[PDB]
Amino acid sequence: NSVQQQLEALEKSSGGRLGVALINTADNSQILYRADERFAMCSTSKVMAAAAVLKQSESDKHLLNQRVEIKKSDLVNYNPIAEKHVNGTMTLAELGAAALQYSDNTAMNKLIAHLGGPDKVTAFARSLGDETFRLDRTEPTLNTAIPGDPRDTTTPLAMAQTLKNLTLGKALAETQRAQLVTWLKGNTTGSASIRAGLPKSWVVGDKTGSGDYGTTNDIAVIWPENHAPLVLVTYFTQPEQKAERRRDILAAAAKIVTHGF
């Protein structure tokens, strides 16, 4: 059973649509499965919003520490960090950290608002050469993940390419790139996803995503102990609106494509 056959087998039993894109930076070789198909990004889109602010900070040395007032009215459906700061302030850096490491939805909306709206995040993605990514809505509606809906979607390959450029490539200035990597490595929400399918000692940075239609996503940068980094995007979605998320499928896909490394 080839890697491709294993992925097809995994999808067949999953009850959903699997999208995988792995880039081996050792030789730029790739393992693709429905890598050109669109999937709702859900919270994985937070990486683009945080990175957009990091790009701005390259020309504004006071941006990351800029105060942002948190009001009760700002709270949406999931605000683990933001709710702790109502009536107070959070810096843009702290909002980036909350959005990425805890998937705080209020934090994401604050980043989008600062940038000027969802379309500004799309423009940033385009500036990075990503012609696929599109952010159309704010939290929490960007998570509807309706089959066939182009809003707030991208493809596994496009996201893998951009994540590579953002964390290991040409997208950000060094200090900003390092900050994004630090945030990703400190994520607290991905234990059961890609990380679960890899050797426990491998260093990993990732951003998970989840939404309606049992949409379960994760994008990660992986640092093996004796090999060049791997960039992996695992997207998964189902036909019924209230389907349960399946992080186990992402872990299984990760194990399949990282075999040998």
- Name residue 230's beta-bridge partners: 24, 222
Which residues are designated catalytic?
43
Is residue 208 marked as binding? yes
Residue 163 is encoded by which pair of tokens? 């994540």
Q: Note whether 44 and 68 are within 8 A (CB).
A: no
Please name the residue that has the structure tokens 């945080």: 50
Distance from C-alpha of 106 to C-alpha of 60, rounded to nearest angstrom? 23
Residue 254 is encoded by which pair of tokens? 């990760």
Is residue 189 marked as binding? no
Q: Which amino acid is residue 122, in one-letter code?
A: T
Domain that holds residue 258: 1-261
Asked how this structure was determined, the answer is X-ray
Is residue 175 marked as binding? no
Phi-psi region of 93 (alpha: psi -120 to 50; beta: other; left: phi over 0): alpha
Burial 198-235 (b: 16+ CB within 10 A, else e): beeeeebbbbbbbbbbbbbbbbbbbebeeeebbbbbbb
- In this structure, the number of other CB atoms found within 10 A of the CB of residue 81 comes to 19
Please name the residue that has the structure tokens 């945030």: 183
Cα(first)–Cα(last) distance of the chain, in Å? Answer: 17
- In this structure, the number of other CB atoms found within 10 A of the CB of residue 77 comes to 9
Distance from C-alpha of 225 to C-alpha of 203, rounded to nearest angstrom? 8
CATH of the domain at 197: 3.40.710.10
Among 102, 90, 103, smallest CA distance to 64 is for 90
Distance from C-alpha of 162 to C-alpha of 168, rounded to nearest angstrom? 10
Helices 174-185 & 46-57 angle (0-180, nearest 10): 150
Query: What 3 state SS string does 119-169 have?
Result: HHHHHHHHHCCCCCCCCCCCCCHHHCCCCCCCCCEECHHHHHHHHHHHHCC
Please name the residue that has the structure tokens 């400190």: 186
CA 47 to each of CA 5, 65, 144, 184: distance values in angstroms, whole numbers, following the listed order: 31, 19, 19, 9
Instruction: Specify the number of domains making up the chain.
Output: 1
